[PDB]
Structure 1
Amino acid sequence: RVDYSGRSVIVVGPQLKLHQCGLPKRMALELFKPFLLKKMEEKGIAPNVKAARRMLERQRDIKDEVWDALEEVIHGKVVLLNRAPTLHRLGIQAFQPVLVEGQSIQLHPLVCEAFNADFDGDQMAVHVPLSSFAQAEARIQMLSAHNLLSPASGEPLAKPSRDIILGLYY
């Protein structure tokens, strides 16, 4: 079991670009909490770290500038999305997170088949790579848009699904 991790229900994210995924605001606030504290100290949102953490503790104490600070925190960074069971390596993929309202994780359509993910209620786990090395590995090697073909066959794995096919064929 592991820190800097979360989970939630998944929801279709048609507007997302392939390298993106929708992350609920509260989830991102918790997963990135130390970075958010440090950024709040870099700006005028808090005098120090402990004040900022006590400020985030209660939900009614949370104001609007902390969300912009969190947006600045996650810029360029990626998270790992994983669906159980993990049958091959594409059961974990890397996505730039987009902060969204609501409590559901938003998943890009073209990766669903890889995860064997549909939207009858599946849930997914989120992980935060911490080091520059971990984030570099995730962005170069584990990014969704960098893994387009199956390592088993070599045929396209991210490709048009039934909904996409239905329109283009039509």
Structure 2
Amino acid sequence: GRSVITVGPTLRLHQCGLPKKMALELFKPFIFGKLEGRGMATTIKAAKKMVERELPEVWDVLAEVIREHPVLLNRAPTLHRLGIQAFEPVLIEGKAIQLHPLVCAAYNADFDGDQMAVHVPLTLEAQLEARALMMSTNNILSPANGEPIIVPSQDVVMGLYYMTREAINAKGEGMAFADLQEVDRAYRSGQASLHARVKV
């Protein structure tokens, strides 16, 4: 399946958001199998009725089938192997596929209307290959050059740069801190500027 992509800033690097309806449609045979195994459905007609009714118990089994089953995400022009990587899906509320901000550079995918195709590996061989070779954490360095490709992009680079600046005169300049913890305590309490020449 496919949908418009969306930045998810609350995602860990190994996981990606997946809409309820796309996940429910893609993993339909897995849901049927788990429903029959748990005995909650006797005939496949009942299982289809539950999955189409979206009964509250079908979300539990959907979560179980999604827990450790990676999925594949790729952009339209895949110019290199990095253009399709495996993500461990997490159920989200909507119709768009949530992407980790740090993998956009590898995908060459901004959020101005891009779409992504999602594929579900089935065989244990396929799942293990997704998790061990093409999981998003495995491919940090670019295959073209050992330099990393999962690196901070525009906004996070701006944040990190602004954090680590220096002001000639700022609130909280001069005193010494016994640990990084005291620095955090002083900054969050508002007694020291974010960029003030201090000792620690």
Q: Which of the numbers 76, 79, 85 marks the counterpart of 1:84?
A: 76
Q: After superposition, give the CA deviation of every residue in 1:88-139 in whole Å (9 maximum; x if it has no partner).
A: 0011000000000100100001100110111111000000000000000010
Match status 1:98 vs 2:93: no
Distance in 1, Cα, partners of 2:83 & 2:50: 36
The one-letter amino acid paired with 1:89 is: R
Point out the structure with the larger strand share: 1
Match status 1:134 vs 2:155: no
Q: Which of the numbers 19, 22, 26 marks the counterpart of 1:24?
A: 19
Distance in 2, Cα, partners of 1:66 & 1:140: 29
Q: Which of the numbers 160, 165, 173 marks the counterpart of 1:168?
A: 160
Distance in 2, Cα, partners of 1:45 & 1:166: 51
Q: How many residues align?
A: 162
Extract unaligned runs of 5+ from structure 2: 163-200
Q: Is the 8 A contact 1:79 1:97 kept in 2?
A: yes
Q: Secondary structure at the match of 1:163?
A: helix
Offset of residue 42 of structure 1: 2.1
Q: Secondary structure at the match of 1:93?
A: strand
Q: Is the 8 A contact 1:38 1:49 kept in 2?
A: no
Q: State the TM-score, normalized to the length of structure 1.
A: 0.92
Q: State the TM-score, normalized to the length of structure 2.
A: 0.78
Q: Secondary structure at the match of 2:91?
A: strand
Extract unaligned runs of 5+ from structure 1: 1-5
Q: Secondary structure at the match of 1:47?
A: coil
What do you get for the CA RMSD once the two structures are aligned?
1.0
Greater relative CO (CA pairs within 8 A, separation 6+): 1
Percent identity between matched residues is 69
Distance in 1, Cα, partners of 2:15 & 2:67: 12
The one-letter amino acid paired with 2:63 is: E
